[PDB]
Every structure is written in C-alpha cells, then in structure tokens.
Design a protein around this nucleic acid. Structure first.
Lengths: 288, 288
DNA sequence: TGACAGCACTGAATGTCAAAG
DNA sequence: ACTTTGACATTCAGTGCTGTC
C-alpha cells in the first residue's frame, strides 16, 4: 500500500546523507528486496534505485551552489564511491561536470529530482517582486559548512551582529538582512567561496555598526518565498526552496545575492518567526 | 485428484521436446495456473515449473552423451532461448558445463531428474554380468540424430546389414549385435561423433561371407537390461534405461561401448522382438 | 484472490588482464 | 613506461513469472 512507501520516503529523504543504502539495505523496511521494488514502482511510478541515486545527486547540485566544500567532501558524504563515480553519474543527470555546474553564473533545475510527496504538500508561499537598489550597512564573513548546517551558521552570524547592534542603538530597525553570495575561485575552478553579509538599512544602523561597511543590496527581479513558523523550521524552509520550489517553477537564478529578511523586533516556548527568502531570478519568455 | 496429474505427467513427458509450456500454457489442461500448481504440488510434491525445467536439462544431458548434435541444437530443441540460457541452467543442475559433460569419459546420474512415477512403474529387469573379449565381424558408421530418433536410425542400420547379410547366408545367426560408441572430436571439444556397429559372432555353423572388419566386443562388467515387446517400444526402453534405471541404481558408466543384442532369427501384426542392452559399468565399493 | 519470498533474463556500470598505439 | 581499447568475469538494479502460505 501507499502508507508503507509514505513512511519509507520520510526515512530515505532524511538519510540519503550518512547512512548507506542499496536495494538490500533499503530492505530494512521489512520486506523482500523484490516485492519492495514492485511496490515502490506501483505507488510512486518510479524505480526505487534510480530515485535514491537522483535524490543524492540533487542534494549534490544544491551543495555545490550553496556551500564552499570541495567536490570530494560532498560526494563522499552522499555515499558515492569516489570523485570519478560521482562525476560520471552527475554528467548523466545534469549534462555537465560538477565543476562547471558550480562555476556557472546562472542556475536552473534542469536535472533536479525533487523529493517525492505522496499526498498533501503545501508549497511555501511565493510572489514575484522587483527590488530597487537599497543602501545597507553590514559585516560580511566567508564561511564553510555542510548543506545541513547552513541555517545554524547563519543564525550565529546574525545573532552576533544583532546583539552587538542593540547594545549601542537607541532605535530598533524593522528588518535584518542576511545576504548570501558566491565567488568562483580563480585557481582551479572546482572551488568557490561563500559569504554571508549581515546588514541593516543605512538609515537604521546609522553609525552603530562596529566594523560595519557600505553594502549595496542589488536591485532587480526576484522570487520571494515566505516562511512563518518555529525558528527551528527554517533549515527545512531553505532546502525545500532550493530543493523543490525553484525546480517546480522552472526558474533560472541570475548571478547575484540571496536575500533573507528577518524581522526580529517581532519575535517562553520556542519562538515563532517570519522571514522571507528572495532569490535573484530571470523569468523565461513563454512562446506563442 | 491424483488421476488428473497422472494424465498430465504423461503429456508432459511426451512434449518437453518441441511444444513450449509454462504455468500458463500448462494451465491449458483445464484449471487455472494458481490452482493447478497447488494440485500438482500437494500431490507429486514438486513445483511444476521447476519439474518441467529439470526434465529438460535431464534430456539435455542424455542427448549430450548419446547424440552427435551441436550444443546449440540440443539447447533449442528443448525450448531454450539461447545457448547461454541453456548453459547457466545446465551448470545449475549438473555442476559441470555441457561441453565438459560430453567430453567426460565416465558418466553418472548426478543431476538427472527422472520422470515422476504416480501409478505403477514396472522398472526394466537388470542383471550385472561380466563379458569376455570377443571377436566379431561387422560394419560401422558415423550417424547423427536426436535423442528421439536413435532407435529408428539404429534400426535402419541393422536392417541394411541384416537383410544384405541374409541374401548369401545358408544359416541364421542366433544373435545380432549393435554397439554404440562415442569419440571426442579434436577441434572444438564441444562436439563428438557417434558410431554404430552392426556385427556378428562366430557361431557353430562353419562359415559366412560378410563385408566389414574384425570388431572387438570389449570385455568387462556390465549391467544388462532385457526387453520384450513391440519394436516400437525399443525407444521407450532405451530412454527409461538411461533416464531412470541408471539413475536409480546410482551406477557409473565407464568408457567403453554400449551393446545391444537382438534375436531376430525369431520374429502379420507388429511382431514381438527381444533384446538386451548392456552398459559398461563400474560398481562402487561400499564402505565398512 | 491476495500479500509476499525468491528466482530467471536483461542490461547498465565497473573491474581485470592484455594485445595494441 | 603509459594511457587506450576490447574480450570477458562479476555485480546489482529492474521487471516478470514461479511458488509458498
């Protein structure tokens, strides 16, 4: 039945990561290696083996754009044999090498295999907006972490800036910005840097940001996803935005910065918070 | 009822040959696949799919030893897709490759799966005998046919010899000999020639004028099976001797020649003939 | 008839020894 | 020496048919 694959998928997704698993290991679901395959193929219309391989290579496309980790660390984490096995496989799915997949100014979901929803999926709310150059003031640091740690690392960088700011400020700014940017390495182009900028509107922060500098929030077209929930749901919010909404919208991310907007001045059970993820986009022209 | 499978087994055994059949074609005897099986199973105590499979490789084995046809033929005639199909399976049941199986000097019923006997199977009469070398004058030729055609081909060979021989003979020989012998090829040892020798022994009637050369009837130990009945049953006889008697007695055939003995001097409804088949054997020594 | 274990043939991927370039 | 290339053994995914309960 579908209630079996329903729970199986919740497991896989959360374990493509560390734990190893092939049709045999996946049998640790209670059934025989074969009945399972036919069952999985009935309920989802997909062959279990080729899906797992595609979810892993999908996480891999995201980890290559969002993190600074070296191509090997990323492949090893997702149970791949070696860089070579990884590469070959990767080329088949995205018709390109991981190195060129990362260096690429633009990004599309051409070969992304989003996770599978077996029934009720509520896609984060989204809207298309145009932003105008917004003068900001902030601190920007290069960071390195796994796809699974992004939310935590960013929360730490934001925490420092914010509490340091409120220590010397008579007024509370309405918004806290978190700008993510990627920079291709000029040596071997398999490497790239990732920076996070915690900033405030120039009007707001005024001369209260210790070690702050001028930052120009770039204007242009963006898609804006909104999130409202426990701060602990933020990690899941970002990955589904990159792992399932961008692809589903068949959109192209332009070179630029990702913009997270927080409204801290609005958050003793875990606190509920709201924030918006803004992705720099290039919409396609529909053909008559 | 046990009578239902009784009739099918007979049909099976006489069609493992050309006609194809599986749990679907086999269900073309009335009941549906699922039910038929449980019947054929709760009775015989064997899976009709595995059975039909085992009977074929069994006949594959016999043909590989008694005929000169190329492996691919044997494999096909018994409804097998390719030679590899046949080969894998053959190894499954016999633990040897067909090629080596044929080449082998000695032979045993290791993997031969004899046809099940529901009703009352009257196994042929046997006796272990020891023969002395004997000179015979005869004729021999390399023949080549299928398992189901042996008795006929041989019969025609004795006929020429016999009637050609009688034309000049003042007295009738009391015994006509038929010696089957195999000879490994020298190129691809997946092939082999088969020779039949029709010959006569010195009797108490002075002379004879026969074409041919001196042939040695090799001495040694043999198992003798005797048959009485229509010359049309001779084919059945040979097969049940090779396909079920050799196996049950768990006997081993030594390199050498098979020996048929006919008493045609005593044979207008289909007349009843009498003959003995002698196979070269080497009995096992038991263990204290 | 149905839920489910296990085998058989195909095929893509990877690994191996080696004549070939 | 050193990577390229093809016959061939081994592996495991994938879809189907056999087979027990």
């Amino acid at each position: 039945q579908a209630g079996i694959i329903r729970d199986l998928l919740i497991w896989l997704e959360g374990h493509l990561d560390q734990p190893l698993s092939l049709d045999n290991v996946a049998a640790k679901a209670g059934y025989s290696k074969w009945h399972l395959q036919r069952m999985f193929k009935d309920v989802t219309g997909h062959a279990i083996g080729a899906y797992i391989r595609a979810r892993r290579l999908s996480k891999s496309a995201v980890a290559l754009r969002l993190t600074a980790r070296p191509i090997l660390d990323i492949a090893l984490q997702y149970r791949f044999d070696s860089q070579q096995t990884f590469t070959r496989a990767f080329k088949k799915q995205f018709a390109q090498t991981p190195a060129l997949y990362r260096r690429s100014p633009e990004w599309s979901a051409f070969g992304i295999r989003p996770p599978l929803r077996l029934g009720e999926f509520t896609m984060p709310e989204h809207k298309f907006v145009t932003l105008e150059d917004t003068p900001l003031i902030g601190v920007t640091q290069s960071y390195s972490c796994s796809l699974e740690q992004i939310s935590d690392f960013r929360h730490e960088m934001r925490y420092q800036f914010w509490h340091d700011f409120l220590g010397n400020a008579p007024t509370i700014p309405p918004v806290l910005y978190g700008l993510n940017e990627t920079r291709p390495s000029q040596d071997k182009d398999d490497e790239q840097e990732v920076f996070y900028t915690t900033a405030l509107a120039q009007d707001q922060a005024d001369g209260y940001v210790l070690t702050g500098h001028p930052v120009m929030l770039q204007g242009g077209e963006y898609v804006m996803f909104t999130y409202e929930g426990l701060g602990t749901g933020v990690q899941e919010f970002i990955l589904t935005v990159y792992g399932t909404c961008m692809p589903m919208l068949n959109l192209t991310r332009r070179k630029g910065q990702d913009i997270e907007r927080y409204y801290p001045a609005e958050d003793d059970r875990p606190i509920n918070l709201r924030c918006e993820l803004l992705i720099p986009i290039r919409r396609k022209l529909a053909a008559a």
